[PDB]
C-alpha cells in the first residue's frame, strides 16, 4: 500500500511488457516496454539493476535444469479457483526463502503464463497480475529479498563482481 515500491512495480512491468510486446498487449497504453513513470537516467542504478534483472531473468532454471515443461501446457485459471493458485504461489515461493530467485521465476513464468492467460481471460487478467505482483511482493517480499540482498545478488550475477569486494565487504562491518 505504501512502503517504497514504485521502481519495483515499474520494473516487473518493463520485463512483463517486453514478453507480451511480441503479442501486442500492454495495460499502460498497448505499448511501453520500459517503465512509463520512473524515467531513470539509465547509468547509475536503473541501468545496472535492469541489465542484471534480464541476465538472471533467464537463469531462473539455468538451461532448464530443474523441472520439466509446466509453463504453457494445460494452464488452469478462472474467477473462482485462481485464488487457490495465488495462495499456493506465495506459500511455495517461501520454500527455501523469498529471495531474488522469486523475481527470475516470476519473470519467465509470469510472461509464459500471461500470454496464455490474457488470451483465455481477455486483457483484464494481465491488468490484475501487474497490481497483484506489487501487492504480493510488497506484502512480504520487498523487505525479505532486500534483507538477504536481492538486487545485490542480481548485479553480482551480471557483473560477476561477487568475488571482487562484496564477500569480505558486507559480511563483518555491514
Amino acid at each position: 500500500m505504501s512502503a517504497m515500491s514504485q521502481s519495483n512495480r515499474e520494473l516487473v512491468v518493463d520485463f512483463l511488457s517486453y514478453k507480451l510486446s511480441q503479442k501486442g498487449y500492454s495495460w499502460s497504453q498497448f505499448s511501453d516496454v520500459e517503465e512509463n513513470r520512473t524515467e531513470a537516467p539509465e547509468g547509475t542504478e536503473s541501468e545496472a539493476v535492469k541489465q542484471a534483472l534480464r541476465e538472471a531473468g533467464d537463469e531462473f532454471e539455468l538451461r532448464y535444469r530443474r523441472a520439466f515443461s509446466d509453463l504453457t501446457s494445460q494452464l488452469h485459471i478462472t474467477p473462482g479457483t485462481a485464488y487457490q493458485s495465488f495462495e499456493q504461489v506465495v506459500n511455495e515461493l517461501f520454500r527455501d526463502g523469498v529471495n531474488w530467485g522469486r523475481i527470475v521465476a516470476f519473470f519467465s513464468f509470469g510472461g509464459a503464463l500471461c500470454v496464455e492467460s490474457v488470451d483465455k481471460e481477455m486483457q483484464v487478467l494481465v491488468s490484475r497480475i501487474a497490481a497483484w505482483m506489487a501487492t504480493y511482493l510488497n506484502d512480504h517480499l520487498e523487505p525479505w529479498i532486500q534483507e538477504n540482498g536481492g538486487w545485490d545478488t542480481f548485479v553480482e550475477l551480471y557483473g560477476n563482481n561477487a568475488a571482487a569486494e562484496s564477500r569480505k565487504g558486507q559480511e563483518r562491518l555491514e
Binding site: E59, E61, D70, L75, W100, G101, A105, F109, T153, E156
Partner: peptide, 25 residues
C-alpha cells in the same frame, strides 16, 4: 478449486529455489 495450482506454486518455487545457490548455480 485449482487442481493445477500444484505446478503454479511448486514449479514456480522450483526454479526460484536457485536463489539458494547465491548467484553461483
Amino acid at each position: 478449486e485449482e487442481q493445477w495450482a500444484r505446478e503454479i506454486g511448486a514449479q514456480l518455487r522450483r526454479m526460484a529455489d536457485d536463489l539458494n545457490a547465491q548467484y553461483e548455480r
